[PDB]
Subunit: 328 residues, 3 copies
Amino acid sequence: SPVFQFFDWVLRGTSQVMFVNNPLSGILIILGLFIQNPWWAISGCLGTIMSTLTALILSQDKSAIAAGFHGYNGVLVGLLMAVFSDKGDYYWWLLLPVIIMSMSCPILSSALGTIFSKWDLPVFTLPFNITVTLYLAATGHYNLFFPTTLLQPASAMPNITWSEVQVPLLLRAIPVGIGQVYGCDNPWTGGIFLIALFISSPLICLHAAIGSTMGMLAALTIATPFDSIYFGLCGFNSTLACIAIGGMFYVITWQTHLLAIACALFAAYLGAALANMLSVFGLPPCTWPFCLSALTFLLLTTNNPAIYKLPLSKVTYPEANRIYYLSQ
Amino acid sequence: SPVFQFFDWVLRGTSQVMFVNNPLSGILIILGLFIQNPWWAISGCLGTIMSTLTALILSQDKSAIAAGFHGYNGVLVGLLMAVFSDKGDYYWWLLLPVIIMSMSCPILSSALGTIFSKWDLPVFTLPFNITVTLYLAATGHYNLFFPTTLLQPASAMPNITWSEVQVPLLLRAIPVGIGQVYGCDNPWTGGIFLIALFISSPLICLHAAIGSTMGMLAALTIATPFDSIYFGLCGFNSTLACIAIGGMFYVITWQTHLLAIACALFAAYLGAALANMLSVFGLPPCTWPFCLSALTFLLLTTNNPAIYKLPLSKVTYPEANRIYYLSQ
Amino acid sequence: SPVFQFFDWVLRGTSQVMFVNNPLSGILIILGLFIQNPWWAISGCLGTIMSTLTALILSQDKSAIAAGFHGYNGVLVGLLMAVFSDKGDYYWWLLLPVIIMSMSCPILSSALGTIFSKWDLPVFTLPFNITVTLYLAATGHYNLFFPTTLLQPASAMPNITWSEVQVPLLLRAIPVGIGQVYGCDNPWTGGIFLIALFISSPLICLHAAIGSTMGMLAALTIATPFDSIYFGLCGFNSTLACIAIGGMFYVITWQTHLLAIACALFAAYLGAALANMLSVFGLPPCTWPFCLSALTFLLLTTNNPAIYKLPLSKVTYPEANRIYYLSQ
Ligand SMILES: CC(=O)c1ccc(C(=O)Nc2cccc(NS(=O)(=O)c3ccccc3)c2)o1
Ligand SMILES: CC(=O)c1ccc(C(=O)Nc2cccc(NS(=O)(=O)c3ccccc3)c2)o1
Ligand SMILES: CC(=O)c1ccc(C(=O)Nc2cccc(NS(=O)(=O)c3ccccc3)c2)o1
Ligand SMILES: CC(=O)c1ccc(C(=O)Nc2cccc(NS(=O)(=O)c3ccccc3)c2)o1
Ligand SMILES: CC(=O)c1ccc(C(=O)Nc2cccc(NS(=O)(=O)c3ccccc3)c2)o1
Ligand SMILES: CC(=O)c1ccc(C(=O)Nc2cccc(NS(=O)(=O)c3ccccc3)c2)o1
């Protein structure tokens, strides 16, 4: 029956946000989202369903849809449209734009696909960034139908007293950091996401934890206010970069491990920079630093024989990549 | 005599703004411009003449100049320099910068030509955008020689009463929308431009009207203030995108018709977004959304056999493209 | 002994800022920097040393390192980090970020190298611009550890009285203009830099002087305040563009001479534009106009046989390029 295949496709698309291709992980992710806020989960599921349907209508490649590559952008756009909303919970009209902008994810992810194929690179999360920035800038806070929350550039020297830092929450910032990938801020959903990652491949989970820790440490060297670190907004760009560079697109080796740690640090600093720059327009920084940093560390060329870049036709998950590299 | 050939070249360059290659259409366009404001027409004609002469001096391709591809950027830069001016009518010194910046149109349109040729794409209007943004940002409002008018970001929630909407002007917004391509705002010049388009090819005229209507409708779903819609600033980016995607660069078919309508809607929303974003610097959004949207819908690849993309060496006008596709 | 070779490498890297490859020129540059401000020289030397060491560790091409192509970005990032600092002279903690960001110069200059090689173009100064913009935006003025100085957009109509212009300083603006390439503002260091350039190749020195004069003249046509022209900030982007286009990457001929002068003028106007635009974020414009203008005048294609573009594998310095072109 086609319907079961379709729902398998949407589950895989939901799972594919953190480079994991497994329906059980998708079920766990949906359970975590419903633990967080039901309205956000509804918006995300609607977004991914509509994105997959539009991709099917435009008749792109069959294997790509069957693997879920076309569904991991709808869930993010739905969740981030439901988060930055001033109307509150259960504002049904918000479901109208979610249908429209989701349709723009299959198109853009195809267009960039023609440009990046020359250098054999992936289209990481650029369509989601473009669509969400477009919508948030088009609506604005002073809108009569879909108002947005306020972001404003800093105006005075922050007040920090180092005698009040609390180690408990500083350590706690890791699960919240890994949970903030989907926009959630509860420790429980962070733990559930960690379990869902670990079910499929341990290496991804370990690298996500290391990246979150790197992001949290990197923000204490420029005197970031403690509230941002506690909330976890300073460590959700590092995890994705660390996962992408560490084991997936490079064959795993200790040199690539160090390179991934460097990627996490660079992503964190670029994230701070873009967060301060984009605050003038009133827009938030969302997965721009990860895209730029991951793209700039996959174009580097070295003569060291241990840093091997896999072709895009074979990347499945780190252990399989290792065995494939060793076999031939 | 060379002089007659030269004036034929400038007339074709003037006509080429709306993808039409015919001297009679150019005469009609000039008549409309002189109906609007004589000073603006003088500036535009000077710009196109200087741009064509510079292109001839740099010795680019002969056929391109003879077809007018090098003259459709000077007229726009001249008109938009004459529009955003605070000194008033008949400020002769303004003719000095117009000579200089026009010379920068043949250069840029060549440079981008080397980059885009890899993927076989056109350089739609990027040189005009780059030059005008450069000039407007360099001068600024607080200038002692060439001051500019004021644009400022919104600061308070707009006041809209839906009981005062007037259907007459809302319907009227279509001819003004098609006339705003050259910067004019009079219904009479809009009608004249429509006639000039219809003389050469009916399909272009029909698609321009449909695109203008789409742009006008798309702005009522985000509560745009009525003055902008009445003035026609919300429907001059959609017409160009609809014309470009509908019949010119794709073989005409109902699938491409729907794709062109989608292009118009996407261009309108991106136009709103860029208009709100660029207001911080004090610059207006001018033909950026059309360029980006048209470029992002010519790189899409599909397996449907009815969406055929013509090579750039054969695009003449939609009926000829249809007959050429059917013949072989 | 390897150590002597290493110090030769860092000297060549220091010299390679103005397209000159000679240790004696490097010694002269260091002498000028130490004449200006010892702290700035310390920061620059540390930056170039760390950049060269990182490039060696990443194991890039051997000839490129031996020629100094990897050391001309560290000195600039060190100098510009030492200039825009509010803490004052001898703030030792500033040496910590200088070590980190310098390590990001070998990486980026490699990544862009894979993209630009398709069209056979160089990576002029983009890594330095990216790194410095990232750091300055990330820290900001309202920072608790590394505060920056303040740049603010203009708010009122400037006051200029043409009866007070002083020809002495207007003529003086040329050596200061050529000296502001490294961030110094003293006439003596400008003269020393001019001598250092002249020792290796007269053509580079002459073109630098012509470019500085062009930049100084171009700023009096838009009523720039006199303080900026006196300080020399209006003529350090033109010199680099004139040197790059005039003799290095094109075979020297009078047509290319005129083209280089045009490049200087275009770079100056784009510099004014970017300076006014980037002031909203609080960042300064640093070698962006030179990069963009030089890149856009190396992609132009003409049928004139006298405008010949050399391959990147043979560019050494203008006289050698001339003799090589004539020989075959
Ligand atoms: C969230 C995130 O960062 C992420 C998850 C998966 C990916 C990804 O990029 N996978 C992938 C794997 C192999 C090949 C390609 N090729 S592609 O050009 O990007 C392409 C995109 C669309 C449809 C067809 C192909 C993509 O990014
Ligand atoms: C993966 C992705 O794209 C994503 C999901 C969620 C986010 C995100 O949350 N971005 C962000 C970054 C900075 C500030 C804000 N919001 S804030 O009002 O300024 C604020 C700052 C401090 C503490 C409370 C709230 C949001 O990004
Ligand atoms: C206003 C507008 O959007 C418009 C009108 C005409 C065009 C256009 O793009 N025509 C065209 C038709 C076929 C081939 C190319 N090739 S090109 O690279 O763009 C190129 C530009 C310069 C001189 C030589 C060639 C261009 O855009
Ligand atoms: C084809 C092209 O490039 C072009 C020609 C003319 C325009 C144009 O008009 N852009 C634009 C867009 C938004 C606002 C303004 N001007 S305004 O002062 O803010 C204002 C807004 C509302 C009603 C009155 C005036 C101008 O673009
Ligand atoms: C000071 C300044 O503006 C400047 C910029 C570039 C040069 C220069 O001399 N570039 C050059 C000369 C020959 C070959 C290449 N090739 S490259 O791909 O860009 C490449 C960059 C990195 C390391 C290896 C090679 C670059 O001077
Ligand atoms: C090669 C390079 O990267 C470089 C070296 C030096 C600079 C540079 O100096 N840029 C710059 C440009 C504009 C303004 C400012 N600073 S300012 O505070 O606004 C100011 C304005 C008026 C008089 C004094 C100082 C700095 O760039």
